[PDB]
XYZ file of C-alpha atoms in Angstrom:
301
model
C -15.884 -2.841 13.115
C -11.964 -2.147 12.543
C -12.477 1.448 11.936
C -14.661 1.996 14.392
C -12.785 0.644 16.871
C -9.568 1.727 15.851
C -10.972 5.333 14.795
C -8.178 8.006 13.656
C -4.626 6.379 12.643
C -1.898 8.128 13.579
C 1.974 7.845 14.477
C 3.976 7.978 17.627
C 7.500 7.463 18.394
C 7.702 5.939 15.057
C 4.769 3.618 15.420
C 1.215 3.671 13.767
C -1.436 3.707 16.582
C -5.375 4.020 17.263
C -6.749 6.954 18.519
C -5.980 5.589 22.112
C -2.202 5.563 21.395
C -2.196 1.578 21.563
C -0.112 -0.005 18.190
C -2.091 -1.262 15.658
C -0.844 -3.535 12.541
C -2.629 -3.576 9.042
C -2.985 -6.439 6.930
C -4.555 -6.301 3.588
C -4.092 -6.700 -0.090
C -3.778 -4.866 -2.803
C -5.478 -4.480 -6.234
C -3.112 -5.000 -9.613
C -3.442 -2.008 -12.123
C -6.960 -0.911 -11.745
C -6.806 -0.357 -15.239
C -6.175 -3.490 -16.113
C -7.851 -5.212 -13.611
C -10.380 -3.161 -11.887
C -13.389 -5.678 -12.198
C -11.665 -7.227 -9.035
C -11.968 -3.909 -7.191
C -15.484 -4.190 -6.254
C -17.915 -3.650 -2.869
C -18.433 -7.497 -2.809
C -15.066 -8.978 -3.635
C -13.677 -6.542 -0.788
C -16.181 -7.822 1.660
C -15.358 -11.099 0.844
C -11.825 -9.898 1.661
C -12.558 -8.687 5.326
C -15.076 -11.113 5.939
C -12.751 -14.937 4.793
C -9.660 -13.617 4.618
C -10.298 -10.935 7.575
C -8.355 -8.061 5.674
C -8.118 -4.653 7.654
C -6.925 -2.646 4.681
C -7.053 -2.796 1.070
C -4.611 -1.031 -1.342
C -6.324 0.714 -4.799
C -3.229 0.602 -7.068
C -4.190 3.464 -9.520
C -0.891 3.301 -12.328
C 0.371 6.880 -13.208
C 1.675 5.880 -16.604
C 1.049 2.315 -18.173
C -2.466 3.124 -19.320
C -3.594 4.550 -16.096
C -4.416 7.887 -15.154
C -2.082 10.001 -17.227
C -3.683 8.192 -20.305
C -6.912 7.590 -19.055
C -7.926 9.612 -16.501
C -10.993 7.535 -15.566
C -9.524 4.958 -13.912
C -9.743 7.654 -11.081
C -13.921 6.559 -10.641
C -12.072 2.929 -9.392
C -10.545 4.475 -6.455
C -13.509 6.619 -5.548
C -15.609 3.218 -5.475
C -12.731 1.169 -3.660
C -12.627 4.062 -1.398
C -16.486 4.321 -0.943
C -16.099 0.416 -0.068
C -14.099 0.294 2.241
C -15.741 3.314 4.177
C -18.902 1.027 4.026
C -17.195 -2.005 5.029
C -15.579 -0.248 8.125
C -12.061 -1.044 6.650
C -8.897 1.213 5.723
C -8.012 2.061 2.763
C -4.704 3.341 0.710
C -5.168 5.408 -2.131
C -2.178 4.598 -4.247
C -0.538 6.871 -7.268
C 1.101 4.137 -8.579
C 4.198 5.700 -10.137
C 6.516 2.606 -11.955
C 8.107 3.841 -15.621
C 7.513 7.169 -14.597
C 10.323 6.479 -12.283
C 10.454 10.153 -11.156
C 7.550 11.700 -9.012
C 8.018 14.910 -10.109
C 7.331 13.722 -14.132
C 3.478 14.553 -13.250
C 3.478 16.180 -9.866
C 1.284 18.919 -11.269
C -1.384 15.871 -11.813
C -0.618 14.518 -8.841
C -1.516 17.901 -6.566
C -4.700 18.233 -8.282
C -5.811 14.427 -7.839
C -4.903 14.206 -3.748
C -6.716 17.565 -3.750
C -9.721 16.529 -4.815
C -9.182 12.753 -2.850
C -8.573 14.672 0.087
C -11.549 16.908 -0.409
C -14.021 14.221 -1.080
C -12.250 11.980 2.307
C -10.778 14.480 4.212
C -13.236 13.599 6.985
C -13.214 10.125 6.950
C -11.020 8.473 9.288
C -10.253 5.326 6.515
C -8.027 7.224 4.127
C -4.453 6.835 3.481
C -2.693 9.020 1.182
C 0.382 7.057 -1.063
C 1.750 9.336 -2.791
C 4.648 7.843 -5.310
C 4.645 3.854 -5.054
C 7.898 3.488 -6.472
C 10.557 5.688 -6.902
C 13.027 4.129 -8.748
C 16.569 5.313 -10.822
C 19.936 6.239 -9.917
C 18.756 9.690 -11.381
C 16.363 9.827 -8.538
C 17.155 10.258 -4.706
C 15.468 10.970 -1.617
C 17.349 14.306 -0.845
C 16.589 15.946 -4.418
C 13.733 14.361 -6.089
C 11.160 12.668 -3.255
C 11.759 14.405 -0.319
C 11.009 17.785 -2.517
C 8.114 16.279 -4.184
C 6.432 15.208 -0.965
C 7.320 18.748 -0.104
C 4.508 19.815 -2.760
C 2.266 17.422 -2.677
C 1.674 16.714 1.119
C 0.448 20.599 2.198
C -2.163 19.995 -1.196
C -3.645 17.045 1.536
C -3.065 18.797 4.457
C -5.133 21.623 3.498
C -8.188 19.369 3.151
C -7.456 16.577 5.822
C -5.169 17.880 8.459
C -3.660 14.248 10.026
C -4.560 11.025 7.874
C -1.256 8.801 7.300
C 0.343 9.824 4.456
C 2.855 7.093 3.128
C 6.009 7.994 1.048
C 7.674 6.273 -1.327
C 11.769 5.851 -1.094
C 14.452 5.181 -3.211
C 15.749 2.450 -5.246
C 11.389 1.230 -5.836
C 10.876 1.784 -2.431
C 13.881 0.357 -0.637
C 15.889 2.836 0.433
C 14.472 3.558 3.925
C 17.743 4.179 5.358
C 18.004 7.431 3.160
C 14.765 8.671 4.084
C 15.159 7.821 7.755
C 17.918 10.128 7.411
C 16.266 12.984 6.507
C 12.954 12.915 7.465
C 9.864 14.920 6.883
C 8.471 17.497 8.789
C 4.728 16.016 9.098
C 4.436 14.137 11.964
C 1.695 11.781 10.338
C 3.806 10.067 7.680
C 5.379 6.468 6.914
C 7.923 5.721 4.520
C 7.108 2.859 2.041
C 8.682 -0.334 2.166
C 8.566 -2.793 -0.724
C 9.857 -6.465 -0.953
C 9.650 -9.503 -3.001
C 9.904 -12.832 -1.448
C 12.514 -13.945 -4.207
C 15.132 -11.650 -3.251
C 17.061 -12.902 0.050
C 16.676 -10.569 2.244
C 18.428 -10.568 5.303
C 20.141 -7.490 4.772
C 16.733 -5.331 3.564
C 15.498 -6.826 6.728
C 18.464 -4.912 8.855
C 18.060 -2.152 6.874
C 14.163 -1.531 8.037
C 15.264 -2.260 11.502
C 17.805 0.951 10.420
C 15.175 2.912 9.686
C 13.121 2.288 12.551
C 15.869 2.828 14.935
C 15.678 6.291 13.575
C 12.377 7.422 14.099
C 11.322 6.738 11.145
C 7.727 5.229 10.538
C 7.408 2.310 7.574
C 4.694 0.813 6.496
C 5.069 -2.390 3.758
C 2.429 -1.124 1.081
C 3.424 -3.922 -1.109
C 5.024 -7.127 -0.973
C 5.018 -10.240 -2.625
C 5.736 -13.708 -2.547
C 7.354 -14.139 -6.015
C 10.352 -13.106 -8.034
C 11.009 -8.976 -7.891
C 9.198 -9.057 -11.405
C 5.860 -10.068 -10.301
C 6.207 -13.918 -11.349
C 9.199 -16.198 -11.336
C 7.915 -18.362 -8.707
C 6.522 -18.663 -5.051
C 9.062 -18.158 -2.396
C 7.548 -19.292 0.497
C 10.052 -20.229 2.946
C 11.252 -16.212 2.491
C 8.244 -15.132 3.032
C 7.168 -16.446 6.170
C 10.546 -15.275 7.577
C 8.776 -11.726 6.110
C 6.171 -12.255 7.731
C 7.482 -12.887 11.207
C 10.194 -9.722 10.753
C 6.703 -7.583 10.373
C 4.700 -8.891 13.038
C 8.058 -8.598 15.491
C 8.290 -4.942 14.479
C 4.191 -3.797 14.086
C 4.546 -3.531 10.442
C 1.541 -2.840 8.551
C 1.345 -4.285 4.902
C -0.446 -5.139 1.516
C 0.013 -8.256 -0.400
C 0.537 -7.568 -4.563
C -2.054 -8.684 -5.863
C -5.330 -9.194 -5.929
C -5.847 -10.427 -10.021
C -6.218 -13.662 -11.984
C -3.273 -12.660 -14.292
C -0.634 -15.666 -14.973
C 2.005 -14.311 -12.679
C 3.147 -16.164 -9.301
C 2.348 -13.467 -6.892
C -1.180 -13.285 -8.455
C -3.758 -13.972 -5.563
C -6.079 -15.774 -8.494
C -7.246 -18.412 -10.410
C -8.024 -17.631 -14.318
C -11.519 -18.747 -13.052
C -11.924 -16.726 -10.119
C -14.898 -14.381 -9.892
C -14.572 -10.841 -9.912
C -17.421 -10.517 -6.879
C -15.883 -12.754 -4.292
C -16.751 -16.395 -2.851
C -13.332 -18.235 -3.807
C -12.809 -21.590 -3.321
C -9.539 -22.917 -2.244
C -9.252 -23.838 -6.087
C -9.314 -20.353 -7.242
C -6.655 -19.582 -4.754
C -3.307 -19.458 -6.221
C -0.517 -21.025 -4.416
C 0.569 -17.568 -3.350
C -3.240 -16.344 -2.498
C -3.693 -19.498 -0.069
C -0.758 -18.602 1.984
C -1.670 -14.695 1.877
C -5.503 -15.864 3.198
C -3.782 -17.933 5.406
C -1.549 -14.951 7.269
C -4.380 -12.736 7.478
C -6.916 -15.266 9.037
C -4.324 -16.277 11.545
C -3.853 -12.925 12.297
C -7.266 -11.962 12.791
């Protein structure tokens, strides 16, 4: 139903909109490491996402380095079937080259042209896709004007070859923060967003006026990952923080995906240890931070 009612994404005046031009706002999760956790990434457990916690999007989170698709280049069968998914279920989906230690897109930009070629030739024509091509940028070593903004540069015309106008998000600076650099010096495709990241255990009043920065430049963002912990992943639920999150992205049309969906003994985990990989939680299986990510989705849907 989403999908085909919303149809082709695209952005104007800094905004992502429906193929009528009206605003529309995205609010899924995100898998972990599919190859860690892939058995969560699955045509069932993401029904179970759209249908009880009403998710519009869902984020495949395919690591770079870390085991992923560098070392094992078969995680790369996950996103095809999270893609194929969420083309079934009528929901949107982010295909995600999940760059962390490999702090630098260009360390495997040759890999990375070849794999959104053949994503883009395989979903080119499906309305669902959206192309994320460097998750998180991170280093003093590495800046928007001489590292990203170049790699894009290579890697979006690979896409745009095969699928001439799905969103393309782009990673900034500093893991993702540093919006107001790329609002700066935006690119030249008119269908991108610049990625936003936040954890809800950094105070963030100031990242909050730095979005509004970006926006007030043009510049498209979409949050395609937040959490509610600690910047590591864990170190508690911050709750209070991230409703104010919350409100900042529903004031400004932000679309987003929650980190993560997994069982792993971390705070911003979604899971339970004994949640099952297909779907059908129980509040019980909810972790603190899962119930309050259900919770923001169903009241928004």
């Amino acid at each position: 139903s989403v999908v085909e009612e919303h149809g082709q994404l695209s952005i104007s005046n800094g905004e992502l909109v429906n193929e009528r031009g009206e605003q529309v706002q995205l609010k899924g999760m995100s898998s972990h490491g599919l190859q860690w956790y892939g058995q969560f990434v699955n045509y069932e457990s993401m029904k179970w996402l759209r249908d009880d916690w009403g998710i519009n999007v869902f984020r495949a989170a395919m690591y770079t380095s870390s085991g992923g698709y560098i070392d094992d280049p078969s995680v790369k069968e996950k996103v095809k079937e999270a893609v194929e998914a969420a083309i079934d279920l009528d929901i949107y989906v982010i295909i995600d080259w999940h760059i962390l230690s490999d702090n630098d897109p260009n360390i495997y930009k040759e890999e990375a042209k070849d794999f959104f070629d053949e994503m883009s030739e395989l979903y080119g024509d499906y309305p669902n896709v959206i192309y994320e091509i460097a998750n998180e940028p991170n280093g003093s070593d590495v800046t928007w004007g001489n590292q990203i903004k170049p790699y894009a540069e290579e890697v979006i015309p690979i896409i745009r070859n095969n699928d001439p106008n799905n969103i393309i998000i782009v990673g900034t600076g500093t893991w993702s923060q540093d919006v107001h650099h790329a609002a700066d010096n935006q690119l030249a495709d008119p269908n991108v967003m610049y990625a936003f990241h936040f954890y809800a255990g950094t105070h963030g009043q100031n990242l909050r006026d730095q979005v509004d920065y970006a926006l007030d430049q043009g510049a498209a963002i979409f949050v395609s990952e937040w959490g509610t912990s600690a910047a590591t992943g864990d170190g508690g639920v911050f709750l209070d923080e991230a409703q104010v999150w919350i409100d900042f992205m529903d004031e400004r049309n932000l679309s987003w995906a929650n980190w993560s969906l997994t069982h792993k003994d971390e705070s911003s985990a979604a899971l339970m240890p004994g949640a099952n990989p297909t779907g059908g939680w129980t509040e019980a299986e909810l972790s603190p931070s899962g119930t309050f990510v259900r919770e923001k989705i169903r009241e928004s849907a």
